Design a protein around this ligand. Sequence first.
Ligand SMILES: [Zn+2]
Ligand SMILES: [Zn+2]
Ligand SMILES: [Zn+2]
Ligand SMILES: [Zn+2]
Ligand SMILES: [Zn+2]
Ligand SMILES: [Zn+2]
Ligand SMILES: [Zn+2]
Ligand SMILES: [Zn+2]
Lengths: 460, 460, 460, 460
Amino acid sequence: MTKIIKNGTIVTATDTYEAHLLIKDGKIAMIGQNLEEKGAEVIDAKGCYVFPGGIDPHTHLDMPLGGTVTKDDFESGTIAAAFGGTTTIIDFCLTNKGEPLKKAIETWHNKANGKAVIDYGFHLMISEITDDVLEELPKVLEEEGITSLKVFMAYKNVFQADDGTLYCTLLAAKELGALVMVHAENGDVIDYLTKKALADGNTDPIYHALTRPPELEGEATGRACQLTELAGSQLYVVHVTCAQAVEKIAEARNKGLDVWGETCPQYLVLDQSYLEKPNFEGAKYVWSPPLREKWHQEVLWNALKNGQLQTLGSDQCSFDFKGQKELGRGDFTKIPNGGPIIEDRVSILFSEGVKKGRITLNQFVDIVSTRIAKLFGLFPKKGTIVVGSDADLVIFDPNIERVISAETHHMAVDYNAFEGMKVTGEPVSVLCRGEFVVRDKQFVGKPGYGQYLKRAKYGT
Amino acid sequence: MTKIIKNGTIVTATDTYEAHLLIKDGKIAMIGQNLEEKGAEVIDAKGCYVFPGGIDPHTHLDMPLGGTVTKDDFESGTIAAAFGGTTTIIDFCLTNKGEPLKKAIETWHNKANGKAVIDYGFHLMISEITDDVLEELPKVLEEEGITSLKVFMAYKNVFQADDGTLYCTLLAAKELGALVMVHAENGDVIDYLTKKALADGNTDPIYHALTRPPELEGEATGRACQLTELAGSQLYVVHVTCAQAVEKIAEARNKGLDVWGETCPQYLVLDQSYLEKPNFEGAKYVWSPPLREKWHQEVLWNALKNGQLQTLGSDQCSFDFKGQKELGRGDFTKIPNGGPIIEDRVSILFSEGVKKGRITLNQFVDIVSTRIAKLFGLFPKKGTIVVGSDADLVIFDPNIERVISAETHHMAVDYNAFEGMKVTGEPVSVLCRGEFVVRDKQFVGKPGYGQYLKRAKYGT
Amino acid sequence: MTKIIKNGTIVTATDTYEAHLLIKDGKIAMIGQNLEEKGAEVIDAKGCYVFPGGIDPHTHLDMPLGGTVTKDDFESGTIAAAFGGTTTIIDFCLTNKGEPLKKAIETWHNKANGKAVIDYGFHLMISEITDDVLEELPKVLEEEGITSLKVFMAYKNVFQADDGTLYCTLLAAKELGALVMVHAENGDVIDYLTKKALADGNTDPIYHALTRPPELEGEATGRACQLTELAGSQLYVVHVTCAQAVEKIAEARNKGLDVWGETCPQYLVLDQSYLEKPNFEGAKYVWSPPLREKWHQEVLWNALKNGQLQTLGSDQCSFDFKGQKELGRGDFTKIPNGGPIIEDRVSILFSEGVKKGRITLNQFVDIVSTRIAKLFGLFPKKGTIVVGSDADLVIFDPNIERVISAETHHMAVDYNAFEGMKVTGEPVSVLCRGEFVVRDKQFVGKPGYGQYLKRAKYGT
Amino acid sequence: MTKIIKNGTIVTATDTYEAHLLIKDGKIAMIGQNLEEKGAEVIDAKGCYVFPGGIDPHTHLDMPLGGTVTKDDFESGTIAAAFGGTTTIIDFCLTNKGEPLKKAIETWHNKANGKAVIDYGFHLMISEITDDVLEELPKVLEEEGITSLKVFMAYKNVFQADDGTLYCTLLAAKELGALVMVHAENGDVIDYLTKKALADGNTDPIYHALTRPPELEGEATGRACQLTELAGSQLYVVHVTCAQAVEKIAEARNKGLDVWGETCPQYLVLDQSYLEKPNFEGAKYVWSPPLREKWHQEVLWNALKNGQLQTLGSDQCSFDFKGQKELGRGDFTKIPNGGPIIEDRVSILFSEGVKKGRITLNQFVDIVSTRIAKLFGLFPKKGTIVVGSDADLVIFDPNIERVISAETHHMAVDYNAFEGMKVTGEPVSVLCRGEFVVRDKQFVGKPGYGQYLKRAKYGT
Ligand SMILES: [Zn+2]
Ligand SMILES: [Zn+2]
Ligand SMILES: [Zn+2]
Ligand SMILES: [Zn+2]
Ligand SMILES: [Zn+2]
Ligand SMILES: [Zn+2]
Ligand SMILES: [Zn+2]
Ligand SMILES: [Zn+2]
């Protein structure tokens, strides 16, 4: 059923113009001004921007971190993201050793199946390279568009992998045509620090941060790079936090190495102090890598501005401060890591970035949608507003001033890391593939509408 | 008179899709598929790409380098560029000390007046900062869209300016909203080297290169940067040649400094040896900075690939090998510097870059058009294929294999620096503002059709 | 019994003068010219240099690497070094997990006890940091002058330690006042490479080198540094081989970090090719890190010249090519790592370094004796020729040209890695604490004369 | 007349031991303990260190900076340095264009002739490279031991030289065997800044500093280096002040380039604030490069600690705050640059450096004496305490606590830049070539005793 979004200001990763969009088969049929066609529902976007739906490449929805599981599942999370201006997510499908990869992949397909309000895809976790694994990978690429393999350098005895596993993954990746993602923190050192902290009675939420200094993020990020170099493949460092890390990634890209960096709003806006703010409130901000000192934020922004860092992810991993977060009272190491971010990701960048001088209206769209779609083989189906691309759009209001509050967010968590934060700009209507998911700040989608996405081989 | 370019594959700096373009007021009216409108001339672009016309920010047309002047004037040069897929050029309007800036600006306007086949703009040369100059600059910005002021760090006693001049220019620029361009070569050292070379009988074309080692390009590029930092303004290093230079620019951009780098095909494809190839043929390749050792080419390409360098210019400055180039027989320093490049710029990057694995079809468009339009305030009038933008298009054939030959080029020079070079891809139809300038590899424009362009203040 | 070494040219790490040395209580009593004292044995050193005995901080004598043990034990090895101009060695006392440190320390004291011809000390290996270990360390410092604790980043499942162990060692070290030494190679990656090499039939000696690329040495050296920085202690990288490694150490020292680098002759003179030279001869050159490509040698020398690297060790670990080396025929990983170097260390540096333009006669003395004595708390007892210091001297002939041959060396190995090598300069008389150990190229010492050395706390 | 300094603790750049020195022909005859010889004056040094007299390579004594001349001439200055523990100075012999070099050299010889209390040498200033200059240089080396040529990159229209002059000097130097010294500050930029400062009424002493930002010192230092590289010669950057400069010099030495850095106490202890401290007092601290922000001091010390910087000079250039300094009341640019430092140089480094943890008792001697003697061809005549070397000694008391005060200093200036500064350690007896110049903190020398020094060709 044809639609026409008129009088809006279109803003792609490159262009900024005024025109109307004629949506047809759930795709953009044509762009121009004063469009008309009997029967079109004609949506009015006056005084609004029309962005390509956002893409969150860093999602953890039905993921289990402890005896508990994320408060937000694939259903709530999808809706949240939908309100936040995000219309496509790529969640991390976790893997267990010895167990066949297609096992996990189906487990995840079930988690998402019929509950997604918007489209999604997966990243495959890798904790070991077995002959059995090597045999599946190629299949995992063709059947199941999983073209991005992930690796934890931290989280000893839980996700961590030795450099040998990382290295062979990089090769396999280069060979098969996949992008290696990496959680760059020196697990082995963080481990001793963690143990000693506890051994000395330091259990408060803040020791979560002090127990893992930025030096260890930088160090890890470096190895990932050096190895990626040796292997001659491609790297994508997730959630770049400290300056040290930004630096390593900068050097890499200078050498022509195919390395990419990503960050998350929480690291751009919040900081280490929030972990001290008080009683047990700290736990609300416990996630890895830990929030750093306020000063790193600049470095991140500049990196974003000049290109050292090129994508923004949420690292969405919700846990009620109530039941969940409290699991680690007299033990910080027992606080489930993760924050409720999938919803305010886009907004915050526009507000803190665009609206304040950092980033450009175009850089914005690139950092939150396009660049990502490209790196993860979703372009041009996703990531842009052009004839042929899916009608994943966001009718955004750039002037509405508001305050982020858990009293308003649509995530199933009992709190919001950006509570009380004033923000300029807000999504008004968000549609995925020609169909509204959120019209006039009101939900109108249906769980199951979202469909899985097989992704390009890191090629066209 | 309405037109429709159908069945082409549209390729912007971001998008790559299939659709038709409905050209209206010399601008792009609308994009979509199966477009129709009685009376439209309907152009067929099957099996072709449709790029935003190229923009050459580095042009020297009616410029005089010696007792002689460039073989190509604004008329021939414009046509050449037109055939080469370039529809907008920004020539360097030279300045004389003590003489009022508006004097030169009009001299240039005359050189271009009624001879341009495509649109153009100017860069204002600066050899000194006088109170009189400071008074004109602001006017030079508002009246006359000249928002890019240029400086030579080399060419002692001819264009060169001390760091004080460079520094105050950077300030003035930051203040007024202009981009400072720089020819980064250590003129004072190159000078002694030059003199000594001659004093020892080394007069062949090759000593033009040996007389100015890449160390001096890097050194100069560094000062420009360090000073740009101190001043807190914006830099744009023209024709980056050696690795050393690329490096300095890389460091700058890492520090968040607002520095930009540009290169030219000749430095990407040719190399120092050509200056030895033989008799006097060397002089055909004499230009500054000099061609370096083959190995720097990689560095350049990687810089282009990863973003250290972001724009491609021609540095067009033609001289017949016959009369002109020969002016410096027993004296290389008397060979007029400059090469016939304005025509094959775009093609070479597509062929050597895109077609061979370096750059992307999108990076290509960015490096040759978009990125440039943006940095020099011509976006979105120029630099892209979108509703509202000027209909500056290029219907390109990506498969036609051919050989660059002066026997075929459309420049008024008796030779071509890329003679015999095999190239893949070629412009078939090039239109500026809805009107064909070159249809089916045949010229159909009219000198004077091209119009001057007032450019943005380094802002929207 | 008083002695007088006259007519020699004294060369310390700083001075170069002509005088006589009056040796008294096994120490240098006084320096001056035309010395006399009834009853003094008066040794004549005309046309000779008098260097402070060399100090080899990298020794593995009675060490066991496999079902076998080093061909040279503390007795032969001591004599060898004695002939080589080395009068003090610091061997690496290996440690086993769970087993008390003082156990090993005594095991070693036994290996050396009554067999040493010259003085010696120990380095304590660390494979784990236990509460039990933390309790002994302080004692290990006071009782037993062991002030240098060593860590293997490679040799997985044999010596290797995680970064946590390395990090806590660095702290303990900073706290206790010890120097952390490190074998910087990424064991986990070398491991997979090793396994795969075999899995593909690559078993020749050369795969020992290819199985462990310099990238992995640099990578490892980097971590060691970064961690040393975090901990704020002191590092000493043993056997720096590749450029990558030299670079990391250079960066560290630039940052003011207290990092030190050491190299060995074999890496300064031999290279990767020797591992291909032929049949099974390759095995003669198998040791870790592996010999690199000829070009790294320069980097090493420059590092040595300018100070990036400051000490020369042998990494003495002999194995008869016959029985021992052959243990790894169809399996390179089974070739015992180590080379017969303790004897030609000093000579080679003088010849290849001093005599050829690299290093200085003074730098020489510093790199082979003084600098080492200082870093390992043996100064000024050892490492110099000055009133009060032990009479550890070497009467060297700087002109004697000769050829290193196993047919002449005094090591118990059936071969010599520098066989056929022409060398200028040779030790004529070597005395430890006033007593000759080697007079006129003839052995005159007695096993047991050498005494253990308790070393300074990395202090005065 | 034979002398014996007994019971002292000898401290060279390498050694630290207890012995007696038998001084003979004004040189050190022999070292040992319990020395005796009828008729020797036997000096007692119990509880004292005995250092090799200090060497100040950065002196400006009878130099004229304006219509005025340094308050301290070669006589007073010599005595001052003598009290300060310095026994050898190398003053900068200034040069005028067009005027023959030997003219200036004799002018200087006159300034020093019969007024020096200790030994001295000269540096030859170079403001231009003429054929006439090229002819003298070689003579200037053989006749007149002037083997160090100096160049100002700042002080436009007064001492400044273009890069061409600097470059050819570097070559000449490499060729002839001289060391090029450089005052690294970007004169052309400092110039505009200076002019503008005045044009805006900023005339206070502090604008002397703000008028020349550290970016300009680093920039300049970089060129000197890059050029020194191109030329392949040797550089020696005088008075390294900011971090930026230290960095450039660090990079240089990393590349193996033969570059050296020097600093001065005032930059190690004082800082920018002193220029604001108040009324006109600021002028007391006006010298170039200007004092920087307190934080650079660390960088300097670390550079000194790790070796990025290797020598300490005074940059002595006294001017009575009264008449002289006041010449620039309403104009800072008219304040004669230079500070009264030749006397407390050594002491301050011992106190602030040695006594406080930075530097070593040995590093101390190296940084203030030895390293310098070596770089400027005075070793081993000067710079060490060894048989054969001149008896230039300093009997130092390491515990005497005191306060530096113009009320006590022996310089002819009406003030002291370190007034009120508490310092530990003080010279008790200073003798040059076996003769006391200062015995028991009391002057006993005679102007004229000091003799000129022809220096080595940057060789043995
Ligand atoms: Zn993570
Ligand atoms: Zn995550
Ligand atoms: Zn140019
Ligand atoms: Zn040009
Ligand atoms: Zn080892
Ligand atoms: Zn070893
Ligand atoms: Zn100076
Ligand atoms: Zn000076």
